[PDB]
Amino acid sequence: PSGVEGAAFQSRLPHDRMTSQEAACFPDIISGPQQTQKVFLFIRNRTLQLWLDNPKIQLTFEATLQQLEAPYNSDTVLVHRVHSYLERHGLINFGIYKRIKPLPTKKTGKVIIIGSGVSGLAAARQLQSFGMDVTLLEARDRVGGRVATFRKGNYVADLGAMVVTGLGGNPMAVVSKQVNMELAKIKQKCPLYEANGQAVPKEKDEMVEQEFNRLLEATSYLSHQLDFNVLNNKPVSLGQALEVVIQLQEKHVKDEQIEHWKKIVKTQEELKELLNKMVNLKEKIKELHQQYKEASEVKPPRDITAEFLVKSKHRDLTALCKEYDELAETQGKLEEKLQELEANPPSDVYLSSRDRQILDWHFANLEFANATPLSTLSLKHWDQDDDFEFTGSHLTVRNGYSCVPVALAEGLDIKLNTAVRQVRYTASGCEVIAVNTRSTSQTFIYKCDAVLCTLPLGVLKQQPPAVQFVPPLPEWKTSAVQRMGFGNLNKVVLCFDRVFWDPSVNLFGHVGSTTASRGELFLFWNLYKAPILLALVAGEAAGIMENISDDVIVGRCLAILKGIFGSSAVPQPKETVVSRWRADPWARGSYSYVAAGSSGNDYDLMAQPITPGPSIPGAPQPIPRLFFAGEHTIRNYPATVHGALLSGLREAGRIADQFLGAMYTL
């Protein structure tokens, strides 16, 4: 898409239709005549285009109206309403841009933001841009959160997010124009290597992959068409479903064999009856010939009865010989029909041991993408965010992803080494009690109008809690926390002095020995300028590999690489890092997934703000005080950076609407 319509696409908006959000802010327009709606839509789309064409400078209402044509620039209040809406909800003027109108002299309202990950930082910038007083409390000694970047000398490798998953409609596309992000495309090709250290032939490499894709489609069929979603009261997982589908494919293989050999016995038993008939006929022919012979031995002259006997037996013999010849005809038909069936048997097995191991790699890769064992994923909902996927090649951040949060962090009040311990929210306001991570006895109190919580779902899940809420979070919120899944995947950064792998190959796989260890160091990444290889630990392996020392992990890494490239081509690594995301107390996992028993609706519940009870009984309904953002709060883009970013923007708009008022809804 291109033009004004492409701007709507790049902003994840339908170009020719008004969204639910727009309907709320402009109920006069959407309920009005179609012509006005199209004027609205064009204004919206054109304003977006303007911002998108140049995202390094602020787009003011004046600059917008300037570049608008008739009859679209005739209604100046409509333009002002649209621009304000777009600025408020962070569709325009978000990220890092030069301000034309320097920030308001004095600030209105006070917001404490827990955590300075991308979701926290995104909101902070927006709120500050709206003229609010903003302070971020970070437990770590750095910004970025799950955007973690290892740096040493010339080696730069991301231990957290790493990939921009396509620029088409990605808000990170805008950010990448604002920040010096060295984006490099990822070549799709991924050669696999079995336990022995030798490549899987393009024959099997395609047979197994196609079978994997087929098995997935099959689970989708099981879910939507056969409605196989509840088993023994428990919700069915993707893992369970895949197992069932595999078992039915092994069943069919045996069913085919059974009825093929069943064809053979039916034909072989026809032959048995024919051969019996033939043996009994050759028996009668043998006897009848002897009788004809004896009748011929009676030399002439003979009376007519004796002549008749010869003739009669002659007739009878040729008659029985006619039958036998027609039976030997049938014998030849069935005899070749048996060589027909025995020549082409059906499939021997569904999948061999070699095949099943390669399939397990494909399962590991899926366990990697969801950062969780397939037995935890919801069958119905695990892929609920597929429709919202971006277009274009996936890219890597070659200079380290941390450049993004660091750039966002500029000009913001951030208290590092500050671990929030308690959140207190009441009808009159909020206090947040944090401590210093270095000396835990040194206590801090923060008074604010509103709290934006961007604590990871892993943190929110902690039992006993690492952060206490006063009053406690409502049951509807905590049940969403328990239901939702928070998965885990880890990385091994290997820094060498020389490139000993294929420089044109971005990623290559290693096929594990067992199902149990399919996730263990199953994938390797070559992405950086420097000689750095990156090893992935997924599925059930991730959690277990955290209890194993770096030396042993790096050991197993070298072993695998030796098997693939040569026992003397793989040198000792100069620098090594191994991530432990489940162990990390400020994460308690890697990112969320749609657990069995959960749905995309739980993400909506997570995003819902909390309104305290009234202080004085009988006092009017209070303002909402506790707001939530982050990866686990955005239904359509969970478990991503852009998702976090977007959730930040979402809350900043909601908070500003609440505490600065929406002037654009009139």
Partner 1 sequence: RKPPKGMFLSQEDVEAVSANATAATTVLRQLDMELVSVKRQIQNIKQTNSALKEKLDGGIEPYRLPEVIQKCNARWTTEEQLLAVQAIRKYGRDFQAISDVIGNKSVVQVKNFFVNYRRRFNIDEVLQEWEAE
* Residues placed in the known binding site for FAD: 119, 138, 140, 146, 162-163, 631, 640-641
Structure tokens at 263: 């064809």
3-class secondary-structure state, position 446: strand
Structure tokens at 161: 């997010």
| Dist. CA 37–CA 150, nearest whole Å | 50
3-class secondary-structure state, position 91: coil
| Dist. CA 128–CA 330, nearest whole Å | 94
3-class secondary-structure state, position 338: helix
Interactions with ligand D51, residue window 482-511 (CB under 6 A): 489, 491
Give me the least distance between CB of 419 and ligand D51, in Å please.
5
Please name the helix (run of DSSP H) or strand (run of DSSP E) that holds residue 509, with its range, or none: strand 507-510
Give me the least distance between CB of 384 and ligand D51, in Å please.
13
Binding flag, residue 424, ligand D51 (CB under 6 A): no
Q: How far, in Å, are 99, 198, 349, 639 from residue 511 at the CA level?
A: 52, 10, 21, 26
Residues in the chain: 666
Q: Which does 35 bind (CB under 5 to 8 A by kind): partner 1, ligand D51, none?
A: none
| Dist. CA 652–CA 90, nearest whole Å | 8
| Dist. CA 662–CA 666, nearest whole Å | 8
List, as residue ranges, the binding site.
Answer: 119, 138, 140, 146, 162-163, 631, 640-641
Give just the sign of the alpha carbon dihedral 362, 368, 373, 379. Answer: negative
> Contact at 8 Å (CB) between 103 and 131?
yes
Binding flag, residue 169, ligand D51 (CB under 6 A): no
Tell me whether residue 59 or residue 466 sits nearer to ligand D51 (CB atom).
466
Binding flag, residue 302, partner 1 (CB under 8 A): no
Interactions with partner 1, residue window 196-215 (CB under 8 A): 214-215
The stretch near ligand D51 (CB under 6 A) out of 38-46, 60-68, 157-165, 537-545 is: 157-165
Tell me whether residue 508 or residue 586 sits nearer to ligand D51 (CB atom).
586
| Dist. CA 192–CA 509, nearest whole Å | 4
Give me the least distance between CB of 276 and partner 1, in Å please.
7
Q: Could you say which of 86, 134, 448, 455 contacts ligand D51 (CB under 6 A)?
A: 455
Structure tokens at 41: 């839509």
Give me the least distance between CB of 372 and partner 1, in Å please.
23
| Dist. CA 245–CA 217, nearest whole Å | 10
Q: Could you say which of 108, 268, 384, 515 contacts partner 1 (CB under 8 A)?
A: 268
Binding flag, residue 641, ligand D51 (CB under 6 A): yes
Q: Which does 120 bind (CB under 5 to 8 A by kind): partner 1, ligand D51, none?
A: ligand D51
Q: Could you say which of 221, 234, 411, 482 contacts partner 1 (CB under 8 A)?
A: 221
| Dist. CA 282–CA 276, nearest whole Å | 10
**Nearest Cα to Cα of residue 88 among 658, 665, 657, 636:** 657
Q: How many CB atoms lie within 10 A of CB 303?
A: 7
Tell me whether residue 86 or residue 420 sits nearer to ligand D51 (CB atom).
420
Q: Which does 251 bind (CB under 5 to 8 A by kind): ligand D51, partner 1, none?
A: partner 1
Residues that bind partner 1 (CB under 8 A): 214-215, 217-218, 221-222, 225-226, 228, 231, 243-245, 247-252, 254-255, 257-258, 261-262, 264-265, 268-269, 271-272, 275-276, 278-279, 282, 285-286, 288-289, 292, 304-305, 307-308, 311-312, 314-315, 317-319, 321, 324, 328
> Which residues form the interface with ligand D51 (CB under 6 A)?
114-120, 137-140, 145-147, 160-163, 165, 369, 419-420, 454-456, 459, 466-467, 489, 491, 581, 586-587, 590-591, 630-631, 639-644
